[PDB]
């Protein structure tokens, strides 16, 4: 990553689209000393531009990225108590404690705002917060039912890994065509209708007694914070989330078409702290659809007033540990003594 000699596929234009994806030309150390060859390069986001002060490129010959069930068990002389109470206040009164040696197996789903895959509630929809008054604390809303979300990114890339040199291992993406729209997704709404209604129901049966509930979109920040940043197999998807949060729920009473969400695939993500960026460099093949079950909501409340006669709720998140509390909610490792 130094400088990129990029161009655009636009020969006539409307809306000043530019491009998130660009097919570019480069100068590349191949073999020996100081030889180069003309090489294709793609950048997800004209000359230069590069990367900012770090770039790890994952790639690799044999890998992939799909969450795999991982069980957490207690050792010898240790147990794990487990609240099987369907209605838990989170800080509170639990009647049924059991002790398992090992969990059923938890899947490592890295996402924000919605839980994808994950676990469902046994009885009704359950809302959970560390401090229902403190708006800075997250609200893990667990569903008894999944809201659909089908994501088809029909962007196409052909894998070419040129092994020109010993230390060097280079890829080449950006072949062919197909004119795929960005990367695309859908959320299926009937579930979303009943679920959101029931959520405002739970909210109004908890802290919200008599209030009109409104849901505005993300408040702003890093691309991982503004969009529903999740992964479809190692590429980082970012979705405009207005379609999920654009409904004003009337306190008076309740009030085939599917919701289609605009998404983008990224290669350059920022893992860890800033020790380095991570790239999934050769997205292989094309036309890859991931069907998911919306198992969740992570919310932060917009501190409002009482003269507004309404309560506003915004998508929050970021620390995946919240997602694990949303998963590791019924496990606490304990030890036994005579």
């Amino acid at each position, epitope marked *: 990553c130094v400088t990129l000699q990029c161009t655009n596929v636009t*020969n*006539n234009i409307t809306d000043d689209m530019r491009g998130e994806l660009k097919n570019c030309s480069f100068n590349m150390t191949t073999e020996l000393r100081d030889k180069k060859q003309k090489v294709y390069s793609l950048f997800y986001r004209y000359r230069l531009i590069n990367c900012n002060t770090s770039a790890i490129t994952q790639a690799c010959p044999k890998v992939s990225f799909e969450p795999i069930p991982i069980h957490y068990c207690a050792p010898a002389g240790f147990a794990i108590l487990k609240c099987k109470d369907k209605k838990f206040n989170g800080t509170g009164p639990c009647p049924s404690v059991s002790t398992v040696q090992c969990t059923h197996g938890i899947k490592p789903v890295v996402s924000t705002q919605l839980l994808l895959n994950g676990s469902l509630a046994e009885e009704e929809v359950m809302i959970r917060s560390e401090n229902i008054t403190n708006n800075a604390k997250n609200i893990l809303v667990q569903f008894n039912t999944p809201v659909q979300i089908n994501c088809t990114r029909p962007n196409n890339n052909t894998r070419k890994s040129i092994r020109i040199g010993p230390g060097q291992a280079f890829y080449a993406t950006g072949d*062919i*065509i*197909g*004119d795929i*729209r960005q990367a695309h997704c*859908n959320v299926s709404k009937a579930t979303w209708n009943e679920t959101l209604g029931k959520v405002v129901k739970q909210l109004r049966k908890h802290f919200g007694n008599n209030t009109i509930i409104r849901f505005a979109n993300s408040s702003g920040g890093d691309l991982e914070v503004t969009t529903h940043s999740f992964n479809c197999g190692g590429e980082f998807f970012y979705c405009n989330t207005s379609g999920l949060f654009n409904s004003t729920w009337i306190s008076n009473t309740s009030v085939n078409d599917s919701i*289609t969400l605009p998404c983008r695939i990224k290669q350059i993500i920022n893992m860890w702290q800033r020790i380095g960026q991570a790239m999934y460099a050769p997205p292989i093949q094309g036309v890859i659809r991931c069907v998911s079950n919306i198992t969740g909501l992570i919310l932060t409340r917009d501190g409002g007033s009482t003269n507004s006669t309404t309560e506003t709720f915004r998508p929050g998140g970021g620390d995946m540990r919240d997602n694990w509390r949303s998963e590791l909610y019924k496990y606490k490792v304990v030890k036994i003594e005579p």
Partner: antibody
Amino acid sequence: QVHLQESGPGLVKPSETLSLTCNVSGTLVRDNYWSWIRQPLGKQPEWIGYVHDSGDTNYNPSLKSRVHLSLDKSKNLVSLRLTGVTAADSAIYYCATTKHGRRIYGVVAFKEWFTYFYMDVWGKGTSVTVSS
Amino acid sequence: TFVSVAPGQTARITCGEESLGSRSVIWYQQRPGQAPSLIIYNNNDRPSGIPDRFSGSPGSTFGTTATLTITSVEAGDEADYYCHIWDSRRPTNWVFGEGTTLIVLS
């Protein structure tokens, strides 16, 4: 029957303005898109532009500054003017009626939606030689 | 270019660049001494008076060229043929594709 008949001077001097008329019968001009198309000797057709009473009108970019298309509803005709002609503008010129179609997919493919035009009725053509 | 064929046999004519996006191809037939006349619109749709001997290749598989097929060719089919390509990733084409002359060796 829809019937178009082009007329023009046959001969134009270099730098002069070419003025052509397309007389229309069997339909009213306001009710159609009308496209002028040109075809030089021994070459493929080269279109010119399309015009509609609605204002939904567009010109070949290469001819943009030199071309004007009009509809005359009172006389039921379509007109073309092309300024600053040269030998390169020598061709048979045709008046036609231009229909519009859309390629429509799923919303997942919205960026790939597009409109296309096809010329379904042609006149007999008028020959234009720009020479001195 | 040129394509020659015997009466009764099948002729095929290629026109335009390889496809990039989704396509709507228009085909026109022009007889000698006549104005251009059409043949097909919307890749495989025919206007009034055109028989099903004439067919166009779908606006489909990416990176391929549009083709007009004429089955059971007769001497009346001898003419110049032109396409006008609409491709979702390309600018409006203001020039028709280069023509092909069909010769029927009667």
